[PDB]
Amino acid sequence: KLGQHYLAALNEAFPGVVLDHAWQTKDQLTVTVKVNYLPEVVEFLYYKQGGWLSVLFGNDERKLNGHYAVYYVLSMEKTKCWITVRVEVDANKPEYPSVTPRVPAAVWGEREVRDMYGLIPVGLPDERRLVLPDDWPDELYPLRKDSMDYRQRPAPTTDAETYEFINELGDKKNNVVPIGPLHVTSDEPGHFRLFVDGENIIDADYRLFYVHRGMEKLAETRMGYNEVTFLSDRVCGICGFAHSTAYTTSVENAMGIQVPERAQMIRAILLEVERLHSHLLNLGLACHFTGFDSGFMQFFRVRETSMKMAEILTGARKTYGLNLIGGIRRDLLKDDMIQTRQLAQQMRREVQELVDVLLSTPNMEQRTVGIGRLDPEIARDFSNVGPMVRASGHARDTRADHPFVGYGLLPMEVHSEQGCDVISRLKVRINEVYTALNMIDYGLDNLPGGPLMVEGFTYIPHRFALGFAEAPRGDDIHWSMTGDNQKLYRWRCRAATYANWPTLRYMLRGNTVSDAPLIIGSLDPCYSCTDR
Amino acid sequence: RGKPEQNPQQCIGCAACVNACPSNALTVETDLATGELAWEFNLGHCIFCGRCEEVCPTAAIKLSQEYELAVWKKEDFLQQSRFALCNCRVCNRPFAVQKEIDYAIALLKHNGDSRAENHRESFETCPECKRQKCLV
Amino acid sequence: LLGPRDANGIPVPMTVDESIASMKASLLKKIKRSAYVYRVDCGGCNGCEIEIFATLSPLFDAERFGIKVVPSPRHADILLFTGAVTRAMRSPALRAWQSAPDPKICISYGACGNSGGIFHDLYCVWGGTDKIVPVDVYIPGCPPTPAATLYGFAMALGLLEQKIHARGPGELDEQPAEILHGDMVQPLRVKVDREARRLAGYRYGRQIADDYLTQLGQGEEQVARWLEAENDPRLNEIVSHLNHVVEEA
Amino acid sequence: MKKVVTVCPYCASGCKINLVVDNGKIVRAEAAQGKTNQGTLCLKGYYGWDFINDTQILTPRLKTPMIRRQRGGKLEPVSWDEALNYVAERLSAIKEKYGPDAIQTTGSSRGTGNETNYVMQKFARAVIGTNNVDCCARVXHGPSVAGLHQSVGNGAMSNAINEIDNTDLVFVFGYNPADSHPIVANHVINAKRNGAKIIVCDPRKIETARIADMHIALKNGSNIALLNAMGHVIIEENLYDKAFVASRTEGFEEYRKIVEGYTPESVEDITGVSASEIRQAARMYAQAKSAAILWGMGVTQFYQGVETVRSLTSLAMLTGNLGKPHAGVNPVRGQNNVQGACDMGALPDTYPGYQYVKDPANREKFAKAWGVESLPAHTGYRISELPHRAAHGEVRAAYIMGEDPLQTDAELSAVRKAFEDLELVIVQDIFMTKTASAADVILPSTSWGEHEGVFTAADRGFQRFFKAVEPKWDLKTDWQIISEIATRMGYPMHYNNTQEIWDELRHLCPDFYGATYEKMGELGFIQWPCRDTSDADQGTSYLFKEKFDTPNGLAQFFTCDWVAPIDKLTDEYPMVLSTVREVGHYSCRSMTGNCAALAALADEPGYAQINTEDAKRLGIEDEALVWVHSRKGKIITRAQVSDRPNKGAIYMTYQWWIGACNELVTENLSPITKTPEYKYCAVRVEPIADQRAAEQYVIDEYNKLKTRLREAAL
Amino acid sequence: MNRFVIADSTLCIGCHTCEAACSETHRQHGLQSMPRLRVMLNEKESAPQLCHHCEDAPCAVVCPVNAITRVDGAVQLNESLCVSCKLCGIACPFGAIEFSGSRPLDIPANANTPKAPPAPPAPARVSTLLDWVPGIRAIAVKCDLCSFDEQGPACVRMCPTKALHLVDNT
Numbered sequence A: 001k002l003g004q005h006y007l008a009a010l011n012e013a014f015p016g017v018v019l020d021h022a023w024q025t026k027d028q029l030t031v032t033v034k035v036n037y038l039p040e041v042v043e044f045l046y047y048k049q050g051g052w053l054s055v056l057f058g059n060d061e062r063k064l065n066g067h068y069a070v071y072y073v074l075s076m077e078k079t080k081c082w083i084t085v086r087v088e089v090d091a092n093k094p095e096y097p098s099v100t101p102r103v104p105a106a107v108w109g110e111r112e113v114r115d116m117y118g119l120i121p122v123g124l125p126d127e128r129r130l131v132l133p134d135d136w137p138d139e140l141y142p143l144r145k146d147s148m149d150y151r152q153r154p155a156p157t158t159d160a161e162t163y164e165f166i167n168e169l170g171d172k173k174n175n176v177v178p179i180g181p182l183h184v185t186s187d188e189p190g191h192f193r194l195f196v197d198g199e200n201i202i203d204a205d206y207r208l209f210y211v212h213r214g215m216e217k218l219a220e221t222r223m224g225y226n227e228v229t230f231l232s233d234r235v236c237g238i239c240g241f242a243h244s245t246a247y248t249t250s251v252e253n254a255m256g257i258q259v260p261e262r263a264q265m266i267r268a269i270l271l272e273v274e275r276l277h278s279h280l281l282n283l284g285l286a287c288h289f290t291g292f293d294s295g296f297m298q299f300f301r302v303r304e305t306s307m308k309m310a311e312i313l314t315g316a317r318k319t320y321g322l323n324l325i326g327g328i329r330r331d332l333l334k335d336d337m338i339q340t341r342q343l344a345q346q347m348r349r350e351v352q353e354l355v356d357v358l359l360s361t362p363n364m365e366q367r368t369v370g371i372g373r374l375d376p377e378i379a380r381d382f383s384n385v386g387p388m389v390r391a392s393g394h395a396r397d398t399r400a401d402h403p404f405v406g407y408g409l410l411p412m413e414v415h416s417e418q419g420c421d422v423i424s425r426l427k428v429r430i431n432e433v434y435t436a437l438n439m440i441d442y443g444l445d446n447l448p449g450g451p452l453m454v455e456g457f458t459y460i461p462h463r464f465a466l467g468f469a470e471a472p473r474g475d476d477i478h479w480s481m482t483g484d485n486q487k488l489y490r491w492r493c494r495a496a497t498y499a500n501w502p503t504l505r506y507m508l509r510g511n512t513v514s515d516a517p518l519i520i521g522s523l524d525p526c527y528s529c530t531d532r
Numbered sequence B: 001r002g003k004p005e006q007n008p009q010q011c012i013g014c015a016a017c018v019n020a021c022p023s024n025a026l027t028v029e030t031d032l033a034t035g036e037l038a039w040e041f042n043l044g045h046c047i048f049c050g051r052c053e054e055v056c057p058t059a060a061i062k063l064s065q066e067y068e069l070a071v072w073k074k075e076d077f078l079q080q081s082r083f084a085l086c087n088c089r090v091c092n093r094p095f096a097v098q099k100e101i102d103y104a105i106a107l108l109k110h111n112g113d114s115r116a117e118n119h120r121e122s123f124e125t126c127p128e129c130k131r132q133k134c135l136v
Numbered sequence C: 001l002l003g004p005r006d007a008n009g010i011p012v013p014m015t016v017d018e019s020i021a022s023m024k025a026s027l028l029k030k031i032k033r034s035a036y037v038y039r040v041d042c043g044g045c046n047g048c049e050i051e052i053f054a055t056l057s058p059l060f061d062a063e064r065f066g067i068k069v070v071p072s073p074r075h076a077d078i079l080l081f082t083g084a085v086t087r088a089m090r091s092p093a094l095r096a097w098q099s100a101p102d103p104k105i106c107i108s109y110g111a112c113g114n115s116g117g118i119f120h121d122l123y124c125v126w127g128g129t130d131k132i133v134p135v136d137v138y139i140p141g142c143p144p145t146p147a148a149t150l151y152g153f154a155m156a157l158g159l160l161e162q163k164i165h166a167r168g169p170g171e172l173d174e175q176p177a178e179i180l181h182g183d184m185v186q187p188l189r190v191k192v193d194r195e196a197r198r199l200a201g202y203r204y205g206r207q208i209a210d211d212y213l214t215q216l217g218q219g220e221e222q223v224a225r226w227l228e229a230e231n232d233p234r235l236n237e238i239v240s241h242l243n244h245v246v247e248e249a
Numbered sequence D: 001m002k003k004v005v006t007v008c009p010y011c012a013s014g015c016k017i018n019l020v021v022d023n024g025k026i027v028r029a030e031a032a033q034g035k036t037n038q039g040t041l042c043l044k045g046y047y048g049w050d051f052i053n054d055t056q057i058l059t060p061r062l063k064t065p066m067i068r069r070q071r072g073g074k075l076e077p078v079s080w081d082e083a084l085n086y087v088a089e090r091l092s093a094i095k096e097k098y099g100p101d102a103i104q105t106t107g108s109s110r111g112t113g114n115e116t117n118y119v120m121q122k123f124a125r126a127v128i129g130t131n132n133v134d135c136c137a138r139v140x141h142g143p144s145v146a147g148l149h150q151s152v153g154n155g156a157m158s159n160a161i162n163e164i165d166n167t168d169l170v171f172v173f174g175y176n177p178a179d180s181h182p183i184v185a186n187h188v189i190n191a192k193r194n195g196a197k198i199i200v201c202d203p204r205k206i207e208t209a210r211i212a213d214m215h216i217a218l219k220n221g222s223n224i225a226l227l228n229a230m231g232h233v234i235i236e237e238n239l240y241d242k243a244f245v246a247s248r249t250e251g252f253e254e255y256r257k258i259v260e261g262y263t264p265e266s267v268e269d270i271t272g273v274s275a276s277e278i279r280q281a282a283r284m285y286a287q288a289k290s291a292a293i294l295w296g297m298g299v300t301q302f303y304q305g306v307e308t309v310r311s312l313t314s315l316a317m318l319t320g321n322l323g324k325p326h327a328g329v330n331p332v333r334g335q336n337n338v339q340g341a342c343d344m345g346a347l348p349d350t351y352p353g354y355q356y357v358k359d360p361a362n363r364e365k366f367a368k369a370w371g372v373e374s375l376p377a378h379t380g381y382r383i384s385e386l387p388h389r390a391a392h393g394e395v396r397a398a399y400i401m402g403e404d405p406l407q408t409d410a411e412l413s414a415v416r417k418a419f420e421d422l423e424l425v426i427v428q429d430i431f432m433t434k435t436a437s438a439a440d441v442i443l444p445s446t447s448w449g450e451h452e453g454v455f456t457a458a459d460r461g462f463q464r465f466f467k468a469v470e471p472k473w474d475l476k477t478d479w480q481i482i483s484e485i486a487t488r489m490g491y492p493m494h495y496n497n498t499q500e501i502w503d504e505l506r507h508l509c510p511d512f513y514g515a516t517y518e519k520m521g522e523l524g525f526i527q528w529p530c531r532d533t534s535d536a537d538q539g540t541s542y543l544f545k546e547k548f549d550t551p552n553g554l555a556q557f558f559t560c561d562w563v564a565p566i567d568k569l570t571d572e573y574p575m576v577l578s579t580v581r582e583v584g585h586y587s588c589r590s591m592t593g594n595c596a597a598l599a600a601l602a603d604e605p606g607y608a609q610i611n612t613e614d615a616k617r618l619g620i621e622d623e624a625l626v627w628v629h630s631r632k633g634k635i636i637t638r639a640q641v642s643d644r645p646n647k648g649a650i651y652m653t654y655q656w657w658i659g660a661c662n663e664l665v666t667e668n669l670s671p672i673t674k675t676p677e678y679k680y681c682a683v684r685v686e687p688i689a690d691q692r693a694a695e696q697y698v699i700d701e702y703n704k705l706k707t708r709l710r711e712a713a714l
Numbered sequence E: 001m002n003r004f005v006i007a008d009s010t011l012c013i014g015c016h017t018c019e020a021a022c023s024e025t026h027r028q029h030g031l032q033s034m035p036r037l038r039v040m041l042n043e044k045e046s047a048p049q050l051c052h053h054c055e056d057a058p059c060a061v062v063c064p065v066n067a068i069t070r071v072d073g074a075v076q077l078n079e080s081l082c083v084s085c086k087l088c089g090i091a092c093p094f095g096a097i098e099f100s101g102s103r104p105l106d107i108p109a110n111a112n113t114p115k116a117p118p119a120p121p122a123p124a125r126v127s128t129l130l131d132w133v134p135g136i137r138a139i140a141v142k143c144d145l146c147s148f149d150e151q152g153p154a155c156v157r158m159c160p161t162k163a164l165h166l167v168d169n170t
């Protein structure tokens, strides 16, 4: 059983704090600790044991045990397992000690739980509203199961935005350069405040969650089990198969569900095919701010032949719908599989020539070095997970630590650079394109065979687990608890860029105005995945 | 993966497709005035997932090869049908779609139910009144 | 302040003056040969945004028809609305509405923009884009294909005309339904359909089972067609399993 | 995962529940091998325990003491300190300025147990100095206990519940076993399984009337005429044990000369039942060797309730079926501790152990044992006339303890007006009920499942229920609150547990001396009178073996001429209203209103049973909302159209809060017992044009009701 | 050669304990919390009516997805495969199948905050074969003989008068 050593270390460091512990799967572990001793346990597992704060979230278990539940998912990466730290916040006085003064990665999860559930982490410095809009009435906490109906819409208190932006390094003489929410080539709402002195950015604050639909509440009220796979696809058009596989594996880990052999690694094939689509889009956007546009339209061309295998492996463009809880909906056939193999190869042909642009190295040496540097010291604290943390030096990858859809039968390579520039994050994505093309080269020629679907099973109530996938921008951790045979009790999703966002203040600092859209797009944000 | 069209000659009024629609593009309401069930499809809600053609008992709703769907007014999105409800033969409360009951009777005649339609009074009886029949 | 409200404070769609709305046809025939379109992305997934940006891509072009994307609402003659109106996004969308010069053309893009899509009844959305501003042209899809985007813009500019219309109740509703594939007994057809759906797919499974059904007419002859024509190992495994289901029945 | 043996807190059948408890939470209820149930429980015993978890389905459970500062003010939460200092200063001030009798104090009958009733009456009679104590046996079998005390001598159930299984005939008269005490109905089932014929006298076609060799469908309120007719058939056909009527009873000639004027042909129309089946019923009851009479609320809850009990018990003397096993008169009790509250002395005319207060010897004994000089002697005022004494200006304060008089009392407008002029109403409850909202002082109490005590079944049988879980709001048991209140202004009154109170009880009662905790224990059933703590006395199954416990030792015959009920069927009120229970939910719906499995079967506004012909012709369909109008109010319930109710009357249910039928009930109290007439009042049912507006009027009034109780309590 | 639970109407007192027992032995499980047996009343008789578990099943014939099949001598319906076509509730000659779905978990029926305008109300109830709520997916609810439970049916066990008994042919 994985995770015994960390539990023993927690027991010897803290003798009588672990009130209860249980195993979800072999590599999944949860512990219930004391409420007043919570920040020491998570800080210990974070700093001393080398754990990364993946996701933390609240729960409404007042009719299950009479208490709120705040979970703290930690990824052990020094074998490698999942540890969740659970606390039982009191009902009529919801207050638990905060982790943000100890672990900086707990700054927005503890701001989200102030809004969705109304729980109060005492000692949290950033007390501003995060997810709910500025016109939201105060005490309506949406994710409380008895606060309001999902269909209720309060009257907007204000038409103007009342958000407060902090200026850490600037003063009352600095000007601001908005870059949202309605900006061209941003293609997605998100506000930015560049506190500039000239063209240099002194400080940078931002307002997000303009695309907060509220699908966490809607996934547990109006919508079932097989239908949330459609909700996960319609979050963003480019992580659709990442969210669906992350949600599906959360529900199949919550029960047994011994999925058939080829239905695992076909999901591994389509997970990598999607990162051909998303990385080559970012590399096209990397050339549209570096300068050349005949490097963009051409990355659009190699993106189209990545869309051509996505046309034949599924038959759809963007949002799809190919996974169910037991297995995959539509199934690949022989010629599709022989064909995808050399269109993978001709892309490796085309990708090599198009990557000869950085070999050219003129705006790819002066515009993309020393710009938007992310400190690996900072990236370790805030627990970034995408190509950000792989460029900064940490070999953080879900497919190597935790093979979820049969990646152990596929050739896995983790690429980590040393520089922390924009050009370093492009080199992460360039080596990931060849890596994903090696898996398409080695996946579709040796399928194990067998069935595709496992259905007819009954959902055991109040069973939960963690589901994870390797999205193109990092990992998405999906935690879902089964409610009954039809509905979910609670489904929580954290986007790949949700962990990535709180370090944009430390990238845009010291840079210029002109390359500031390049710094934001260097990590390839998916606002719709993080805004939920 | 084009527009869902419904064949009204083959829809039996079983909210199967309505229950499987994630975006509630398909809606049914029971109109006691007219004794009819108002089946409706809205293209302004449809996310083109294809669950409706998956769960249709009689394959009436299909997604065609039609992708040119822009309109000037919102009411052109709607596909509407009305099916006469079947009144009970013990009480007279409307309990099911008459076309659905006739389709069920046709299904039972095929696999071998020689006297299916001579038992039509059992099929056009509400399940509450059918439970009172076996009590006596 | 920006938008009108009820007595409760819930927002309502704006009502343009008829003096302002009287010259929309003249504006359309003015911008028939040159349309300035500003994307107003609201609370929606990138799908309904990247495909709109793909309307000027190599596969589908918009400048050949005169459509040029503008950087400001002040330059806009057509305001393209994309996502479901989030409560945080109603005020910027309204600001983009009043910033444009009157009269305007509004095009709702996608299911999420037409009526809210899958988030139609939810506390953080106001529904579709017609719940805040008037909408002239509705373009459905999730996401709309670039052919649909070109058709929507061409029909908005008068180059094409509307194709689909409403269908109401009629005589065909009460005509009885017929048994499909009413040759063998319904149990086996249902069982082999489920067996093909488990192994192939919704789509592939109906297809394989229906091929098998036409081949139940001549056992050996079309067993042979399914075995030889495809030469697909996978299709052959699907047919063998379906055949064992029917045989054991 | 340990099992705690408890006694079901709903009805007087006294079933034993094996509450399985893990951690400090209850997971399930199991059927225990008790004396009464023997491993069979109804739905309320199986799935009626989850009201203690504060589910807030109907009403929020109480947490803190709350003091209302001025009527029109609000219930604002307060510490126990001043909640109880206020309830001592105000009570002492009232007993100084007005009188000891200006105070009035109820006793509970549901989950508090016997020891709480004993300490409550001890508090009242010692600290207060009043006999103003009345449980809700007043609105229950008060006519039954009064008639039995005047006629046979002992006012309790004279035979065991388990003794019905071996009778030769069961005579059910105005009692519904299948909906009130389901295990008693199962006992009647096995009695029919042993060969006993069953005669049911009920206007409806109840489930017990189905297992019956013959059933009597009589007119509402015509019990005396039928009883006199069948007694005349017994006498004139000379069918009785005269040996018994010559040796053991007294007063036969007056009964003979007063019943002879009531032959069956004259009542063949007042009782609406033909003479041939009356003769068959009288002959069948006379020739049965050992036969029992079971009567309920179709007897006592009338103007002529006491006289009907006298007639039934006199007719039992004629048949000679009184004092032998598998026979006797069996008034089946109501709540699970109403027989316990009767024994413990929570009545305004008796001390604990069925000792009356008119005797100065008992008034010297209890003054010696407690500590004041002599306890007050005046028979006290009753809870049914409490609005009458409050409006007239005779009673000033009401210590309501574990009842709901704003839902379960007649003429609810008069109750509301009484609570407005009553300057203080102290409600000691476990829920925010209707009365708990209109209370000037409210004290939270420990529920049934979280304390200890003694319950008494319908057949006078003591039983023990044990503590399962701890309370989660530092709130104390009822005897603790009573003891602290008495300490803060009067007597030093302190108790450690209920065993000390039970030992004090056995010291003060010669009839409960043999009922000790260790003899009862886990699965014990000890039917008082038990006199020896030895294992010699396991209880007393039947009464009247050798003496009738009468001052003469001889039973007395009595009956009178039938008189009509007070309200008459008039032009605009042609419909008889009878307020009748049902299985599934319990009275006032505080508990069973917070149980999800029980509230998932029937929620609101309830079903008023309509005869098919009556609705077919008045225009009312099988599930339609119906405006039911009376002289004192108009309310809405649905309609359950079936031919089981008799024509001309509707049978309707008072457990519902929206559409409660107690607004319609005009209170006409009995002549001497002062019981409200729930089983007969004149109404008119009328349909509603727009059912959707009335259906919305169901919902918003149901939500505005829950808005008040969730505002005051929280 | 079929297993079914029958009710003795002479022994049934109409206590609705069987309804609450069947509703709770499935609510603790994942299945539907609607009782699968309903106490039917007339003038002279009273007995719950449930699935007869017929030797030839008209419900299984009309099923489009083969959700109804015979296993262990009992006609068992898989609630994870039913597509709410409601054809089994028509072909059943005894009215043993009704249709209900799952409410949102741990959420009350009326959770309308007074801080916002109230949500639109539910449509009026007409019949389980016609009704549709957007948040509720109705499923054919039938007596499954408590096959998941290890101590037999909960209706037979928790009957106060022992009216229900399991009829079993090999």
Ligand SMILES: Nc1nc2c(c(=O)[nH]1)N[C@H]1C(S)=C(S)[C@@H](COP(=O)(O)OP(=O)(O)OC[C@H]3O[C@@H](n4cnc5c(=O)[nH]c(N)nc54)[C@H](O)[C@@H]3O)O[C@H]1N2
Pocket (backbone or CB within 6 Å): D108, D110, D111, D112, D136, D137, D139, D140, D141, D297, D334, D335, D338, D401, D402, D403, D404, D405, D408, D409, D410, D428, D429, D430, D431, D433, D445, D446, D447, D448, D478, D579, D580, D581, D586, D587, D588, D589, D590, D591, D654, D661, D662, D665, D678
């Ligand atoms: N119309 C009409 N009215 C009737 C009747 C009728 O047939 N028709 N029946 C009458 C009869 S026979 C009776 S007995 C009465 C019964 O009616 P009530 O006297 O009202 O008795 P309950 O309904 O049990 O009221 C119980 C109250 O006590 C509380 N309680 C429960 N357990 C405990 C406990 O352990 N401790 C404390 N402190 N409180 C507790 C409950 O929360 C609730 O507030 O109703 C009478 N009213």
Ligand SMILES: Nc1nc2c(c(=O)[nH]1)N[C@H]1C(S)=C(S)[C@@H](COP(=O)(O)OP(=O)(O)OC[C@H]3O[C@@H](n4cnc5c(=O)[nH]c(N)nc54)[C@H](O)[C@@H]3O)O[C@H]1N2
Pocket (backbone or CB within 6 Å): D011, D140, D141, D173, D174, D175, D176, D177, D179, D180, D181, D201, D202, D203, D204, D206, D219, D220, D221, D222, D223, D295, D296, D297, D298, D299, D333, D334, D335, D578, D579, D580, D581, D582, D583, D584, D585, D586, D587, D588, D651, D655, D679
């Ligand atoms: N489920 C449930 N069980 C309860 C209770 C509860 O609230 N819920 N309450 C308990 C209490 S508090 C009590 S007192 C007992 C009482 O329980 P029961 O004695 O059974 O009382 P009811 O059901 O009110 O009345 C019994 C019968 O009296 C009939 N009746 C009405 N009018 C007349 C008449 O004029 N003559 C005759 N002969 N019959 C008539 C009615 O038709 C009904 O069939 O029940 C207890 N059991």
Ligand code: SF4
Pocket (backbone or CB within 6 Å): B006, B010, B011, B012, B013, B014, B015, B016, B017, B018, B039, B055, B056, B057, B058, B059, B060, B061
């Ligand atoms: S599923 Fe098919 S038959 Fe049923 S309502 Fe929909 S279209 Fe009609």
Ligand code: SF4
Pocket (backbone or CB within 6 Å): B004, B020, B021, B022, B023, B024, B025, B026, B045, B046, B047, B048, B049, B050, B051, B052, B053
């Ligand atoms: S395609 Fe999907 S969203 Fe559209 S009507 Fe069918 S089920 Fe509903």
Ligand code: SF4
Pocket (backbone or CB within 6 Å): A234, A237, A319, C043, C044, C045, C046, C047, C048, C049, C082, C083, C084, C109, C110, C111, C112, C113, C117, C118, C141, C142, C143
């Ligand atoms: S229409 Fe579809 S793709 Fe476009 S924003 Fe809405 S959900 Fe996303």
Ligand code: SF4
Pocket (backbone or CB within 6 Å): D008, D009, D010, D011, D012, D013, D014, D015, D037, D040, D041, D042, D043, D044, D045, D046, D181, D182, D183, D184
């Ligand atoms: S008869 Fe009374 S004690 Fe026994 S189970 Fe029913 S409600 Fe509980």
Ligand code: SF4
Pocket (backbone or CB within 6 Å): E007, E011, E012, E013, E014, E015, E016, E017, E018, E019, E039, E047, E048, E158, E159, E160, E161, E162, E163, E164
């Ligand atoms: S639980 Fe038993 S007595 Fe009660 S209705 Fe059901 S079968 Fe009849």
Ligand code: SF4
Pocket (backbone or CB within 6 Å): E050, E051, E052, E053, E054, E057, E058, E059, E060, E075, E091, E092, E093, E094, E095, E096, E097, E142
């Ligand atoms: S549902 Fe009806 S037809 Fe099917 S097995 Fe049960 S009783 Fe027979």
Ligand code: SF4
Pocket (backbone or CB within 6 Å): E062, E063, E064, E065, E066, E067, E068, E077, E081, E082, E083, E084, E085, E086, E087, E088, E089, E139, E140
């Ligand atoms: S409701 Fe379910 S079981 Fe019944 S016919 Fe339809 S799909 Fe089959």
Ligand code: SF4
Pocket (backbone or CB within 6 Å): E005, E021, E022, E023, E025, E035, E036, E037, E050, E142, E143, E144, E145, E146, E153, E154, E155, E156
């Ligand atoms: S056998 Fe099981 S499923 Fe069927 S009615 Fe009884 S308890 Fe319910």
Ligand code: FCO
Pocket (backbone or CB within 6 Å): A236, A238, A239, A242, A243, A471, A472, A473, A474, A475, A476, A495, A496, A497, A498, A525, A526, A529, A530
């Ligand atoms: N990649 C991606 Fe989408 C985001 N952020 C996910 O997961």
Ligand SMILES: [Fe+3]
Pocket (backbone or CB within 6 Å): B088, B089, B090, B091, B092, B093, B125, B126, B128, B129
């Ligand atoms: Fe009917």
Ligand SMILES: [Mo+6]
Pocket (backbone or CB within 6 Å): D139, D140, D141, D333, D334, D335, D338
């Ligand atoms: Mo009573």
Ligand code: NI
Pocket (backbone or CB within 6 Å): A236, A238, A239, A525, A526, A527, A528, A529, A530
């Ligand atoms: Ni994304």
